[PDB]
């Protein structure tokens, strides 16, 4: 079940508030497998605390490693449906632009881009 179906909006806000206090320099990220996805396995976990200086292009490589893929297997990590592969922007900056109203930054991964 998606993260948002599992935790109320209030409980998500509280969780981000706590992460601000316990890990002030990490961006709180939710990474989830696209609903239709067939080729790629599910990640071992959903919630990621990412140091705010990490480039989005590095995050892409990190999640790919976590999936233990070959360099044959296509992988896309998307933020509000934008692929992050070429994005050298620090996650701190994407966070400020794209954070959910609950304070989490949501991402979705897939073996294809839709358009």
Swiss-Prot record:
Effect in UniProt of substituting residue 26 to R: Enhances binding to RETREG1
Keywords, sorted A to Z: Autophagy, Cytoplasm, Cytoplasmic vesicle, Cytoskeleton, Lipoprotein, Membrane, Microtubule, Phosphoprotein, Ubl conjugation pathway
Phenotypic consequence of residue 49 to A: Decreases interaction with ATG13
Membrane topology value: Lipid-anchor
Gene Ontology terms, MF aspect: microtubule binding; phosphatidylethanolamine binding; phospholipid binding; ubiquitin protein ligase binding
Cellular component GO terms, alphabetical: autolysosome; autophagosome; autophagosome membrane; cytosol; glutamatergic synapse; late endosome; microtubule; organelle membrane
Functional note: Ubiquitin-like modifier involved in formation of autophagosomal vacuoles (autophagosomes). While LC3s are involved in elongation of the phagophore membrane, the GABARAP/GATE-16 subfamily is essential for a later stage in autophagosome maturation. Through its interaction with the reticulophagy receptor TEX264, participates in the remodeling of subdomains of the endoplasmic reticulum into autophagosomes upon nutrient stress, which then fuse with lysosomes for endoplasmic reticulum turnover.
Subunit structure, as described in the record: 3 different light chains, LC1 (a cleavage product of MAP1B), LC2 (a cleavage product of MAP1A) and LC3 (produced by one of the MAP1LC3 genes), can associate with the MAP1A or MAP1B heavy chains. Interacts with TP53INP1 and TP53INP2. Directly interacts with SQSTM1; this interaction leads to MAP1LC3A recruitment to inclusion bodies containing polyubiquitinated protein aggregates and to inclusion body degradation by autophagy. Interacts with ATG13. Interacts with ULK1. Interacts with TBC1D5. Found in a complex with UBQLN1 and UBQLN2. Interacts with UBQLN4 (via STI1 1 and 2 domains).
Entry PTM: The precursor molecule is cleaved by ATG4 (ATG4A, ATG4B, ATG4C or ATG4D) to expose the glycine at the C-terminus and form the cytosolic form, LC3-I. The processed form is then activated by APG7L/ATG7, transferred to ATG3 and conjugated to phosphatidylethanolamine (PE) phospholipid to form the membrane-bound form, LC3-II. During non-canonical autophagy, the processed form is conjugated to phosphatidylserine (PS) phospholipid. ATG4 proteins also mediate the delipidation of PE-conjugated forms.
Identification of the protein by name: Microtubule-associated protein 1 light chain 3 alpha
